[PDB]
Design a protein around this ligand. Structure first.
Ligand SMILES: CC(C)CCC[C@@H](C)[C@H]1CC[C@H]2[C@@H]3CC=C4C[C@@H](OC(=O)CCC(=O)O)CC[C@]4(C)[C@H]3CC[C@]12C
Ligand SMILES: CC(C)CCC[C@@H](C)[C@H]1CC[C@H]2[C@@H]3CC=C4C[C@@H](OC(=O)CCC(=O)O)CC[C@]4(C)[C@H]3CC[C@]12C
Ligand SMILES: CC(C)CCC[C@@H](C)[C@H]1CC[C@H]2[C@@H]3CC=C4C[C@@H](OC(=O)CCC(=O)O)CC[C@]4(C)[C@H]3CC[C@]12C
Ligand code: NA
Ligand code: NA
Ligand code: NA
Ligand code: NA
Ligand code: NA
Ligand code: NA
Ligand code: NA
Ligand code: NA
Ligand code: NA
Lengths: 416, 115, 416, 416, 115, 115
């Protein structure tokens, strides 16, 4: 129990918050408390949200600069270059599938013109001021002389920061040995930020408990939440079932003309380990062993690709994060236009690359995604109440894609 | 964090041999590739050799056949064995160690002169 | 003369400013000049204040990161850890005594609810955006629908920057040799900032003279200023006497059960040197010699603790700074609530550690404190008129505590 | 052709933009498009403007810190110090001549009080917050009780950032070996920014074509624009002729008391090469050879001063940039007061030092100047229409001043 | 600024001896402590030895009795004398120089292998 | 980027001789000057020697006639030949390479002790 203690504490905090909210609503309520006591009652959760929002800027910028600078063509070769594109394409497909399923099934269900929305998206992709982008983004309103007038409004331009960090990292990659000092600087800043993040995660259970208690106090019919939350789970699992049994096998067959289910039968046992442990790092050795022995993939392919995919290629996490973003948007009565969906997909692909191969590795990336589209982050406490279940299917889908990519590259090598 | 220590450079005669060594010390989560690039005076940097986890290797077009990259799997060190050296091989050689999509470490560079 | 040229020029500047203001007011005045000449008349002082406010941010952030990263447990051992706790506790007690004396005795005397004030304090302690915190702070107002609504208003969040710099420095300390690049980066940025600070101090006499002239012109009863200044000096000296003759001796007796006044009689000559020179660095050699020979403190304690305390333990400076903050608040008719008092104590405890063991070493830290609580900084030129006195009483209190700490540790060594 | 591909592409883009604008104006004009279609039509140029404004900040700050830190007294000696003073003075004189001629001839022609304007300039030279200066600047308006009230308004404080970068670089120069890490950090950040700048320049023709098309669509009389463009060329060329045939020879004669036109006859072939190639770097070898042989300048002076002046001393670029700034101000019906003229001169003197010895090296520095004085940058597409001519006349003036500088210093060596 | 120069280290047989040297050059206002930490592969860094102004010293529990830290007060250099070395002493050794509440300097690290 | 490698220095008897070398490796657009500064314990930085493009040289007043700076134009290296060394010549010596109004490179410093 010492391992995964934080996951247990998050679930216990959710239960305690539910009990606290029900007790406060029963013996009194929000009306009896009044705004004075209500605002102070939810304050620890607000402090948690402020800390999460604070660490977003350095984390995103430094990690993306390092990730872009490290894409050395020689270190990848043709095999790694093709593997990285396969990873990107399948993550994009998983994100699109999650968004589409959550829009079609509506788990959470109970303005600006189109051209102006696209133009605002383009202006935010290329911000005109790096310092302003850390706390503002461009938005267009209309004045009736309806002519559009735009200006910078409050809210961190996460998408612009992501684009700048990637482009700056590509510049550092071009400089190579000349950019070594900046590469070390941003890497060490990222490590210090990660220390801060680990400190924040220890405070997280208290903030989560009070966030849950506040939401339960505000809610009228709590029993309705569990009707939507359960539906949310379905949208996740179904997605994992479609990506893992239809989409990825179809890609493997289309590039290989071989049975993908024989490959999956060769990797069943690492998949069982991935479900049981909810960790990609724990199932990587078994995965390499089974892919080499049962599926006949050369060691120079498996021992290179699978360790990278274990960290980098996370289709399950991306599908879960997109489903969660759409589910929270539906819970909050917010409307998702094409600009917000595009932002969700892009930030989800980057965050799925950045998500960790550990239990509940995708939650902080989900917080980043929600912040990127101005969605309520306090709803995250709802999705981590069932993360012990969704995350294991996520891990299965995360390791299966690595295995199938290795098999595809092995087939290409065998044909050449 | 990784610290790269380079050794084995200097001046040599045409047709001679050198053995560069790049040793990585410290902590890296996942070392994917280790290798050498070189930059001649006035030209862009060019790949010399890579060895990746799993054993695959790659070489630059000019140095294929003569140069050989090898790994000491015990202490996470790479060796570049340069044979039949030619005046065109005079350059600054940088070793690098890469964790793909995480970070890259570049060496300070060693001058190699063939004359 | 050349040794204390800057202090002498500061006093000459305040005298010349008084003369210039009296001449301008008596011959004509503000009305004769009008706003078009009053605005340009006081401009050099505004420029000085502008330079100080600009230099505040890098200085605070870099110095606090460096100070926090350097708290290596092995470099301190048990003795240094206990000495540092003693230093912090006594500096807090000095700050609290100064605030309390300046509140009871009011030398300067001629909205938001309590819960919202505390919540705003907690929000500013943990800012949501590091970039925004460099120029903005969270404040709560009320809309009558009294629903509290908060947002970011102008004014640098100094407290949040202090807290972030300390936490980041602790993270760098935890990284150790891995945080070496960032430690060097922030140390060198601090050195460059200190070069700029020295240049600004060289400009300071002109700005101070024009600030004094403007304040004299704007005021009618100048003798009242001298009365309030005398009361402020009395508050500072009384606080120093109480801390040095009652509080610190009581702490020494409680931890040692020996006579603290015999120990103080063992260090009379270094105390006289501290008063005469107004410098803790010039007092340190004789202080170590007297503490070793007259008071029987082992060299491995004195030669370690006393040099550290000469720089980091400044109770007199902290008491003076808190008294000055309250005095300026009373001169400006501002109200000091509990949030402002907490901010004063915290910033003073940090700035006393950050103050220098030189004459007039705590003036810039006082400017930082006033900026932290949104108090007028142009009033500093008034207290600078008497620093040559007050600072000399600070040094005696700055070097006394270091001595009593050493004798407080030696006793433990004698008992173990 | 491949060597000057970018210049050819910019001119081709200007021609294509003229064609697009004329075709759209003939086929209904902006009225047929409507505001939405017009905005979408002009958007690609706005993207280029946003990219330029985004790279402005790191480029200016890092380049100026590096340039200031490198002014080592021993690396320069008396000769280099006098040469740098001569370079600065002649660049200031060229900028003043350009501003004066553009004000007198009015090529482009078809509220705040003076004291408050100067005070706002002084407040912006010394910003009170470094982070705020990245996107805001101080401005004074008036309220009727008219008392001036000031605050920070939108618009990056380029002058304040320039001054801070210079003073920080000078502090690093004083630190010497101790400022080495910061010097390397800012140098490498400048290199990465320059990589981004080259990528933006590769995108630039597409944005320029649409900027030109959007300008042509709005205007009714296109023939008047060509007459204004012709007057701008005449102003630039007249300034170059006056500076290169009257001012510089007068300075040389005053310091030397011999014929400056004999010295200029000594360098006719390098001047012809500078005109033909439009490059100072391609002129430097022949210039050194001709100066040393024909004009009898010692190699220890030529081989030191002329390479430095080939990069840092650009009188023609400064004169052209000031003329262009005043021309664009007159085209936009903006008023240039003394504060804006001072800002133009200062930013131009810095930027001609920062300009490159390549064809069209001064365009980006011109964009920086226009942003510094809040002038429309999109008018640069007009200047780019004729740069292939004007820039060549700039190059002759860029390499002449170096030569007459060296021949000046040699005279002193002959006298001493 | 302070520059730390490390010397010593390398490969030693069990029961052998080593003498690490860490020299601080440059200007520091008040050097409070100087010492060595070590990090073995897969473990966190642990205190090896420290000597402070005034002469007090501290040692890690594992290395007490065998390791001895001493100071050349003339040049602000410290020496770590390592005797009766065990195979568990194989680690990267970092020297550090600390001015308390001002700043800390870490060395690049020297490998020590006992086998 | 330029990397400066220093060689020479150490302990020398009074009246002895030394030959410091600073070599610049890498790419600089225009090297304008190269030289040595020194800092003695407790004193400020002072110029030792500088050689500039075109051949001009300058020396510190205390070292004129004894120290000689020279350039190997082949490999962009400078040599400081110190003769008749005296105990006042004990300091940390920093080489630097300057592109005027672009950037400056400082060396790490080499200790020179004359005793
Ligand atoms: C919300 C969605 C629609 C945003 C999608 C935008 C990104 C997919 C684009 C925007 C800007 C693009 C970048 C613009 C410039 C470059 C530089 C380019 O580098 C080179 O051409 C040379 C590379 C080298 O030599 O290192 C590589 C692609 C890259 C990083 C691009 C990658 C893709 C980016 C990030
Ligand atoms: C009203 C007053 C109390 C306001 C001032 C608040 C500060 C005194 C608090 C706020 C946040 C606190 C920090 C929150 C987190 C940490 C991390 C914590 O680090 C560890 O637990 C591990 C240390 C390491 O391994 O290096 C050390 C205390 C510290 C710096 C705390 C120090 C005290 C801080 C700065
Ligand atoms: C817009 C027009 C009207 C005025 C432009 C203002 C600048 C030309 C001024 C404003 C502040 C000045 C700086 C203020 C302080 C210093 C530090 C000063 O350094 C020293 O005194 C010591 C130098 C060293 O030891 O390295 C050198 C001049 C300098 C850079 C000044 C250079 C000129 C600056 C940039
Ligand atoms: Na994927
Ligand atoms: Na990931
Ligand atoms: Na995976
Ligand atoms: Na204290
Ligand atoms: Na003290
Ligand atoms: Na202090
Ligand atoms: Na000039
Ligand atoms: Na020139
Ligand atoms: Na230039």
């Amino acid at each position: 129990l010492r391992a995964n203690l934080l996951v247990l504490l998050t679930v216990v905090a959710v239960v305690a918050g539910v009990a606290l909210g029900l007790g406060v609503s029963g013996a009194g309520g929000a009306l009896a408390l009044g705004p004075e006591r209500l605002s102070a009652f939810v304050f620890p959760g607000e402090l948690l949200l402020r800390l999460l929002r604070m660490i977003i800027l350095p984390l995103v910028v430094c990690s993306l600069i390092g990730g872009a600078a490290s894409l050395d063509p020689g270190a990848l070769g043709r095999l790694g270059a093709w593997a990285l594109l396969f990873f990107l394409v399948t993550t994009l497909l998983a994100s699109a599938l999650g968004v589409g399923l959550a829009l079609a099934l509506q788990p959470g269900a109970a303005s600006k013109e189109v051209l102006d929305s696209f133009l605002d998206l383009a202006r935010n992709i290329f911000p005109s001021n790096l310092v302003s982008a850390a706390f503002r983004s461009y938005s267009t309103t209309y004045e009736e002389r309806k002519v559009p007038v735009g200006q910078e409004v409050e809210g961190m331009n996460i998408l612009g920061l992501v684009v700048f960090a990637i482009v700056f990292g590509v510049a550092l990659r071009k400089l190579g040995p000349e950019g070594e000092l900046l590469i070390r600087f941003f890497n060490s800043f990222n490590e210090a930020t990660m220390v801060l993040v680990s400190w924040i995660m220890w405070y997280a259970p208290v903030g989560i408990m009070f966030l849950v208690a506040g939401k339960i106090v505000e809610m009228e019919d709590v029993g309705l939440l569990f009707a939507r939350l359960g539906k949310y789970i379905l949208c996740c699992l179904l997605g994992h079932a479609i990506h893992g049994l239809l989409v990825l096998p179809l890609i493997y067959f289309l590039f290989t003309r071989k049975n993908p289910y024989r490959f999956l039968w060769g990797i069943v046992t690492p998949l069982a380990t991935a479900f049981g442990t909810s960790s990609s790092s724990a199932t990587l050795p078994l995965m390499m062993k089974c892919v080499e022995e049962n599926n006949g993939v050369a060691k120079h392919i498996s021992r290179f690709i699978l360790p990278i995919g274990a960290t980098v290629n996370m289709d399950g996490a991306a599908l879960f994060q997109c489903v969660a973003a759409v589910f929270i948007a539906q819970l909050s009565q917010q409307s998702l236009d094409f600009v917000k969906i595009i932002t969700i997909l892009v930030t989800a692909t980057a965050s799925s690359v950045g998500a960790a191969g550990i239990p509940a590795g995708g939650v902080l990336t989900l917080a980043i995604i929600l912040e990127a589209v101005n969605l309520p982050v306090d709803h995250i406490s709802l999705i981590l109440a069932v993360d012990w279940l969704v995350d294991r299917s996520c891990t299965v889908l995360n390791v299966e894609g690595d295995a199938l990519g290795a098999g595809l590259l092995q087939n290409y090598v065998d044909r050449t | 964090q990784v610290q790269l220590v380079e050794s084995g450079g200097g001046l040599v005669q045409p047709g001679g041999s050198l053995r560069l060594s790049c040793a990585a010390s410290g902590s890296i989560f996942r070392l994917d590739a280790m290798g050498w690039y070189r930059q001649a005076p006035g030209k862009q940097r060019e790949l010399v050799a890579v060895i990746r986890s799993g054993g695959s290797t790659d070489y630059g077009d000019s140095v294929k056949g003569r140069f050989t990259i090898s790994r000491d799997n015990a202490k996470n060190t790479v060796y570049l064995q340069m044979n039949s050296l030619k005046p065109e091989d005079t350059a600054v050689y940088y070793c690098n160690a890469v964790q793909i999509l995480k970070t890259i470490y570049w060496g300070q560079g060693t001058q190699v002169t063939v004359s």
